[PDB]
Amino acid sequence: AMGTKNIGKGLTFEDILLVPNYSEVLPREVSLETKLTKNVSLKIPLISSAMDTVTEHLMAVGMARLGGIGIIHKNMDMESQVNEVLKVKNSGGLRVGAAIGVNEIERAKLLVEAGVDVIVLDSAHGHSLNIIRTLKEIKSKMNIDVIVGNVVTEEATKELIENGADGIKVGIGPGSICTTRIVAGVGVPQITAIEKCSSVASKFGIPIIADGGIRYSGDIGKALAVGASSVMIGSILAGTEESPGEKELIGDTVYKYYRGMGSVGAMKSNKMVPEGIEGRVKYKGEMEGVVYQLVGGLRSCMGYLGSASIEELWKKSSYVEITTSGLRESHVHDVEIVKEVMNYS
Amino acid sequence: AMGTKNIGKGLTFEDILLVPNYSEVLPREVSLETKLTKNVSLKIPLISSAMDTVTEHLMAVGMARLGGIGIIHKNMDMESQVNEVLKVKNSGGLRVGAAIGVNEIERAKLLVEAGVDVIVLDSAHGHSLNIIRTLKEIKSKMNIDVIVGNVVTEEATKELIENGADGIKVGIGPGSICTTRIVAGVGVPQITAIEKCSSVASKFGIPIIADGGIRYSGDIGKALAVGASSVMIGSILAGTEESPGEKELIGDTVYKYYRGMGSVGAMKSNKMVPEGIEGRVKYKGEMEGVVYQLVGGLRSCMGYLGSASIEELWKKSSYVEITTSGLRESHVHDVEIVKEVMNYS
Amino acid sequence: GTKNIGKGLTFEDILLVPNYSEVLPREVSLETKLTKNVSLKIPLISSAMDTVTEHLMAVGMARLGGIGIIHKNMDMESQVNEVLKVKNSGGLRVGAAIGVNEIERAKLLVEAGVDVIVLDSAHGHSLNIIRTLKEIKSKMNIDVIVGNVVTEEATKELIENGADGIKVGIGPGSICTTRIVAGVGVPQITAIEKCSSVASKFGIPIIADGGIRYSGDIGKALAVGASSVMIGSILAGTEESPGEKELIGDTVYKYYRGMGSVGAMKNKMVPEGIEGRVKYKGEMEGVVYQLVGGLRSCMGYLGSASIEELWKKSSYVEITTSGLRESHVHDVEIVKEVMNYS
Amino acid sequence: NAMGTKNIGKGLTFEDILLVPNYSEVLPREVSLETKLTKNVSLKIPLISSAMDTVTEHLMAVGMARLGGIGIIHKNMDMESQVNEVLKVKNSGGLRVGAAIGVNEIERAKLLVEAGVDVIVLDSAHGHSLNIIRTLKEIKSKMNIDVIVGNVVTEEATKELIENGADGIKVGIGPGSICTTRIVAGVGVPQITAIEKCSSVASKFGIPIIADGGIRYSGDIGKALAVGASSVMIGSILAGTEESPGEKELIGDTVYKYYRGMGSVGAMKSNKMVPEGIEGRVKYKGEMEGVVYQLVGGLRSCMGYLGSASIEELWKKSSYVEITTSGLRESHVHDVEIVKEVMNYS
Numbered sequence A, B: 001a002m003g004t005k006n007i008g009k010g011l012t013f014e015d016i017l018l019v020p021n022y023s024e025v026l027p028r029e030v031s032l033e034t035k036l037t038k039n040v041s042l043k044i045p046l047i048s049s050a051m052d053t054v055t056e057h058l059m060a061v062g063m064a065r066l067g068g069i070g071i072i073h074k075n076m077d078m079e080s081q082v083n084e085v086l087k088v089k090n091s092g093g094l095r096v097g098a099a100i101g102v103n104e105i106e107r108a109k110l111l112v113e114a115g116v117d118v119i120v121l122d123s124a125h126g127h128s129l130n131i132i133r134t135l136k137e138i139k140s141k142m143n144i145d146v147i148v149g150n151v152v153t154e155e156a157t158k159e160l161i162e163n164g165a166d167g168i169k170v171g172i173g174p175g176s177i178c179t180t181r182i183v184a185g186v187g188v189p190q191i192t193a194i195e196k197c198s199s200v201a202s203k204f205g206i207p208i209i210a211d212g213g214i215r216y217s218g219d220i221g222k223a224l225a226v227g228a229s230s231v232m233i234g235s236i237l238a239g240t241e242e243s244p245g246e247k248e249l250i251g252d253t254v255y256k257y258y259r260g261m262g263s264v265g266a267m268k269s270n271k272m273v274p275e276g277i278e279g280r281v282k283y284k285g286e287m288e289g290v291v292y293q294l295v296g297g298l299r300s301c302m303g304y305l306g307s308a309s310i311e312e313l314w315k316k317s318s319y320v321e322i323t324t325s326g327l328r329e330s331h332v333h334d335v336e337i338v339k340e341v342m343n344y345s
Numbered sequence C: 001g002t003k004n005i006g007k008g009l010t011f012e013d014i015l016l017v018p019n020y021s022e023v024l025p026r027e028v029s030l031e032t033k034l035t036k037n038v039s040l041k042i043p044l045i046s047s048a049m050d051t052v053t054e055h056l057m058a059v060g061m062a063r064l065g066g067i068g069i070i071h072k073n074m075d076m077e078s079q080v081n082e083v084l085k086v087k088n089s090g091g092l093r094v095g096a097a098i099g100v101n102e103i104e105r106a107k108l109l110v111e112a113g114v115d116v117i118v119l120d121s122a123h124g125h126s127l128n129i130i131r132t133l134k135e136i137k138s139k140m141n142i143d144v145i146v147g148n149v150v151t152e153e154a155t156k157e158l159i160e161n162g163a164d165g166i167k168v169g170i171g172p173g174s175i176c177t178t179r180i181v182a183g184v185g186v187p188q189i190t191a192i193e194k195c196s197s198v199a200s201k202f203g204i205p206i207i208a209d210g211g212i213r214y215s216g217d218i219g220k221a222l223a224v225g226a227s228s229v230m231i232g233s234i235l236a237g238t239e240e241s242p243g244e245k246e247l248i249g250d251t252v253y254k255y256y257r258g259m260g261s262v263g264a265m266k267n268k269m270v271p272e273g274i275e276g277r278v279k280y281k282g283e284m285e286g287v288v289y290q291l292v293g294g295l296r297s298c299m300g301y302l303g304s305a306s307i308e309e310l311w312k313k314s315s316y317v318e319i320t321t322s323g324l325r326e327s328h329v330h331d332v333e334i335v336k337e338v339m340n341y342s
Numbered sequence D: 001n002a003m004g005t006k007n008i009g010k011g012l013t014f015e016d017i018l019l020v021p022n023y024s025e026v027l028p029r030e031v032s033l034e035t036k037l038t039k040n041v042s043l044k045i046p047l048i049s050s051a052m053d054t055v056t057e058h059l060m061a062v063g064m065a066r067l068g069g070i071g072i073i074h075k076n077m078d079m080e081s082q083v084n085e086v087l088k089v090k091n092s093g094g095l096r097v098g099a100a101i102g103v104n105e106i107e108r109a110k111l112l113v114e115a116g117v118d119v120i121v122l123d124s125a126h127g128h129s130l131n132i133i134r135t136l137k138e139i140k141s142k143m144n145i146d147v148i149v150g151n152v153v154t155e156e157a158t159k160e161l162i163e164n165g166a167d168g169i170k171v172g173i174g175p176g177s178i179c180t181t182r183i184v185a186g187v188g189v190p191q192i193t194a195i196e197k198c199s200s201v202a203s204k205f206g207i208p209i210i211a212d213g214g215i216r217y218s219g220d221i222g223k224a225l226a227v228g229a230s231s232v233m234i235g236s237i238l239a240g241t242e243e244s245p246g247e248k249e250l251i252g253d254t255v256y257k258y259y260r261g262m263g264s265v266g267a268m269k270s271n272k273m274v275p276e277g278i279e280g281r282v283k284y285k286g287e288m289e290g291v292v293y294q295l296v297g298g299l300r301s302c303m304g305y306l307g308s309a310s311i312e313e314l315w316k317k318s319s320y321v322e323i324t325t326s327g328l329r330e331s332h333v334h335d336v337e338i339v340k341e342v343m344n345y346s
């Protein structure tokens, strides 16, 4: 009762667990440095999403000072985007990124001369002709690293690299605010997607960015273990003070807004078919604390895997599949939490 | 320990995700024409269900104008069913369909004389002696395309085609209001159902109608991608103004009544054993808006699969299986939804 | 896992596949065998449980072509009186339950004219059960149903020692906790399939006991090899059921407990069933009708005019949790009750 | 093939399996529950209370040893208060008792041994590490006492610890009620598979496996042992009891007493640190003896169904099936509303 078009089972983060290794490294000893693109390096593998409710200059500066990096979003006029990147990199000469859309060549040139360090050429569907052509023209008119996405296949990864991609960004449907997989029925579970694209990208030494889906620090580890060089994360940071967003109080708890870029209110700035929704998140206050627990989680992970660098994590990692009942085991069960903890909201 | 009567794992829409392909086509540019039966074609692949709470002249004209078609139900006397066909057909010469049950041979005859374009010969169990007979009985006395259902096996569909079926409706159990799989314990998960029937029907150039189970626009893309020529929808249109039945209000919001044809009220028109229940659905106002975003979801899908027609969708589509945790990924997770979206409610 | 011997499936796990059919549900024959010598008109048995089956319930099943097993949780003559009342009423067929080593109880029941005796146990595949089985068969002319088991080997051995019927089911009952307290059991479909592979070779009927929630489960159970099903909770809420009706909301309930529960045992005892509560569903007859209606519907879709033909022609697919939600009513809110689906 | 080359297979946990009944001549009351705690120390029952500051101190340890099991005093205190605590147990009839220590705590260990502790539990969130192996070697060279080392979940960890003098191996990473390791670090192995793998190595060497964490119900005991463990370690069940340290609180009309991970913020204080446990509460379940009685009742019942008169016969004759979520629904109570609460089944 099985069909010719079934190409296998796809796995998400909650589907797997990482297997502990013989270890002689402490979590405090772990190197977290990583390549963002082929030519840009980072000291922590974290990237804040290119979203209007997540990353502007204040988020980027915060990211860059902690060793990561932020991608200013393109939902604004061209050189107000330039002002954002001028702010960050006048500020301690920190390293920063910016996003552009299909054929937005003028926007990109400006950002480059504003000193932006990486351009993220993003799209609902990176493995597309308009994307490929937009990438070729950039690399011919501009000397700057370009991350391209989003994609989820071998074929996409390979072809984008063959045309100049300095980084490949993975993820269709995994985001907290994404409805693509429901509206269009399209996607690939984030672990399998990162796996497929790693097996090609690593051949060329091109970094993969695992975009979307990250819910707990343990997910950061899984993503990297499987072949990512960094993760892009939206909803975790959208709770912080540094995200742009309007705070609201509905009951006894305070929230601020987090919406998809393919959401109706995002596209207005109708007869539209949206693939993102508009939502809120619990306000988690200060950035530096959220990021620290994320980094804490990853160090703990790599220690369990006896891996002192991302690169050693790739060599030594393995995982087991788990069931729904395995996941139940993995979470807290049968006891009732008396104090909120930042790790585990 | 496994058993010899187990013939495999049957999959439904939530069990899979369609995988992106290289695309040179934008959702805008996609063609959606399809074949309803081998001699009748539609310009969108959508059919409204033959239900007393879904389709009548008003729904049918609305469907036809949009480029689809409506099947007027048979929960009425013969002459009034004919009246319904005349209403749709005098209104712009639009295509329209009518359902008949087994042995209902003069009903069919009248309907055809009334200029109906297709007859839908329906039964809970399409693959039975009486349906075959009724089918051969219509083709001999009438010149009209006949759709036959419902079935879910490939031998069921081969045998209906051999006796003159112009289309086959697939679906046992998947309906929103269907209890056949619980009362009788019988059915096949809709994807596996469509796959098996496609593998026979397509070699004869006979269209598969995937009937029942559609919950979101991405479901439509899945159904067509694995072989369907079109889809039949009840509950999504049941809550439109153009639906028959009247609104009633329980709380803040108003609901419009949707029931099975196998429900007791439906068969009332009580020593009965029902395979359908009686329920309510959100009133979602005008159908045009409802349908508008179904079509947009499909286009979005076909865009992701680089397919500019259903033909190419058939050639190029592949899918992965996902776990229930992969499904938790695909939906919105960890964010509270601030405002309504008709795509996703 | 070395010890992993495969995946076991329950009723919710599968769907039956439709066959070419030329038989209407109304035309289907539901005759079957209880034991190799006792046959029924409908393949239903009410559970030998003190909240389910006494004389008023047993006479109820036989009425509709089935049978009920009077429970052993009473003294001998009172059980004997229960079987006398059913026999004296229309001469209808009835059964009664006894425990291990309770041979005396047994022929009192036999002398009272019981049609079938159910030798039951938490664990039918045990030395003591085989002992009692063997004395009974030597001192009494009676069909004996033995349980509960879930393996090929248990089925084979019980039959080799004289068993006239075999009850299958360890842990599926609505009120059972065995799989939680002991960690033991086998999912009901796989269990029936295992036991039918042996039992049908010998022409010994299997009773699928417990776990039945909807009429679709009856068809599944028979389709994979059972000759009948035993039913507790569906019937515990009926009128002809013993036990008592408490009102708590604006809806009516009556109690239903496991025979391995604290109240059913009366305390340093180790409970393996619980004390519970079930919606009152009025008169039995309507419940049975809807169950038979469901099964006739099932066999219609499979083009099977009898159980023997249902055995020959049935296949199933496995479904996910997601398939299961497709299968139930989804995304529509139900206006008022239906008997089938509640 | 959407199959990843780093995928080494499916891991299973207690709720994923069911034990299959065997022919039986033995009754639950006839079954032997003796087992080996460590290579040289043995118990009347396979139960061990957890080394947690909300579960085991002398009163719990005494209570355990009474019933034929053993308690492990937690290390979340100074050195000779832990010593005094094992003194309390030993002067209560020479009962068996154990004590936990951490990496490089050789001094504490020495003081524990001098006080007559029967076993030292060398614990760590990651038993398969350089500093644990070293600590094991140093203890074994300067002292004579059985050392249990954990926690691990792999064959090679199991092998490497035995090769360096481990007398018992404790299995479990992420399974516990108050544990968030698998969410914070994304690391662990489902408990059944974990015990299996570690059993396949340890049994050859005659080294007992202690199954640590994840026990929700008595039938989980039988499963851990049937798959190869010689004992199970239990926290949350006993945390609710009377002899548990931690003082009661009432929030509902129901009493609770607190239960926290040793890797919880509060426990570690005993803000700039990263939690792999949480701080919670459990229903007060009254006196210990009833709770332990029910768990033993359950196991005896398991072993009866499996026709196994001892743990070694259980290891030989056990088998299981994988079940699905729907199988688990079948297994729990269903379609019935519970009128009287049951200690078996909370």
Ligand SMILES: COc1cc(NC(=O)Cn2ncc3c(=O)oc4ccccc4c32)ccc1Cl
Pocket: A123, A124, A125, A128, A180, A261, A262, A263, A267, A274, A275, B023, B025, B026, B027, B300, B301, B303, B304, B305
């Ligand atoms: C690039 O062409 C395509 C576009 C779509 N759909 C969209 O672009 C919808 N959309 N329209 C605008 C946006 C957006 O800003 O951000 C998104 C992020 C993720 C997913 C979608 C969007 C988005 C579907 C298929 C194809 Cl082939």
Ligand SMILES: COc1cc(NC(=O)Cn2ncc3c(=O)oc4ccccc4c32)ccc1Cl
Pocket: B123, B124, B125, B128, B180, B260, B261, B262, B263, B266, B267, B274, B275, B276, C021, C023, C024, C025, C297, C298, C299, C300, C301, C302
């Ligand atoms: C075709 O004969 C059969 C009928 C049934 N049951 C029914 O059709 C009951 N029923 N009785 C009336 C109806 C109905 O109007 O619409 C249905 C839609 C789906 C499923 C059932 C019905 C329905 C079962 C098996 C067989 Cl073989």
Ligand SMILES: COc1cc(NC(=O)Cn2ncc3c(=O)oc4ccccc4c32)ccc1Cl
Pocket: C121, C122, C123, C178, C258, C259, C260, C261, C265, C272, C273, D024, D026, D027, D028, D301, D302, D304, D305
């Ligand atoms: C004595 O044989 C055994 C008995 C048990 N347990 C019991 O019989 C407890 N019990 N004690 C009385 C009963 C009972 O009436 O019905 C039951 C149904 C299922 C499970 C248990 C019972 C039950 C478990 C294993 C074995 Cl090997």
Ligand SMILES: COc1cc(NC(=O)Cn2ncc3c(=O)oc4ccccc4c32)ccc1Cl
Pocket: A023, A025, A026, A027, A300, A301, A303, A304, D124, D125, D126, D129, D181, D261, D262, D263, D264, D268, D276
């Ligand atoms: C140095 O060993 C490691 C320690 C950790 N983490 C911790 O020790 C955190 N922690 N820090 C203190 C504790 C603790 O007392 O009990 C625990 C129980 C289980 C899990 C963690 C703890 C715990 C992670 C990876 C490695 Cl390799």
Ligand SMILES: O=c1[nH]cnc2c1ncn2[C@@H]1O[C@H](COP(=O)(O)O)[C@@H](O)[C@H]1O
Pocket: A049, A050, A051, A150, A171, A173, A174, A175, A176, A177, A178, A179, A180, A211, A212, A213, A214, A232, A233, A234, A235, A236, A259, A260, A261, A262, A263, A275, A276, A277
């Ligand atoms: O509107 C949307 N629809 C679908 N995906 C989106 C949308 N907006 C952002 N995304 C993706 O979701 C990611 C954030 O995922 P999150 O960290 O799980 O919330 C972004 O980096 C984008 O790749």
Ligand SMILES: O=c1[nH]cnc2c1ncn2[C@@H]1O[C@H](COP(=O)(O)O)[C@@H](O)[C@H]1O
Pocket: B049, B050, B051, B150, B171, B173, B174, B175, B176, B177, B178, B179, B180, B211, B212, B213, B214, B232, B233, B234, B235, B236, B259, B260, B261, B262, B263, B275, B276, B277
């Ligand atoms: O009462 C019934 N029982 C089972 N299926 C039904 C019944 N009435 C209609 N159907 C089927 O369900 C389809 C609509 O399902 P929906 O789109 O999921 O709500 C119809 O087109 C019929 O094929």
Ligand SMILES: O=c1[nH]cnc2c1ncn2[C@@H]1O[C@H](COP(=O)(O)O)[C@@H](O)[C@H]1O
Pocket: C047, C048, C049, C148, C169, C171, C172, C173, C174, C175, C176, C177, C178, C209, C210, C211, C212, C230, C231, C232, C233, C234, C257, C258, C259, C260, C261, C272, C273, C274
């Ligand atoms: O207390 C008990 N513990 C476990 N199983 C029981 C107990 N009492 C009765 N059973 C079984 O459960 C069956 C009924 O289950 P039900 O039809 O699903 O509610 C009975 O026929 C017995 O086989």
Ligand SMILES: O=c1[nH]cnc2c1ncn2[C@@H]1O[C@H](COP(=O)(O)O)[C@@H](O)[C@H]1O
Pocket: D050, D051, D052, D151, D172, D174, D175, D176, D177, D178, D179, D180, D181, D212, D213, D214, D215, D233, D234, D235, D236, D237, D260, D261, D262, D263, D264, D276, D277, D278
């Ligand atoms: O804070 C912690 N994080 C992770 N595991 C812990 C922590 N504290 C105790 N444990 C483990 O959890 C076990 C008890 O879990 P339980 O029996 O399921 O409640 C203990 O025996 C330890 O192995």
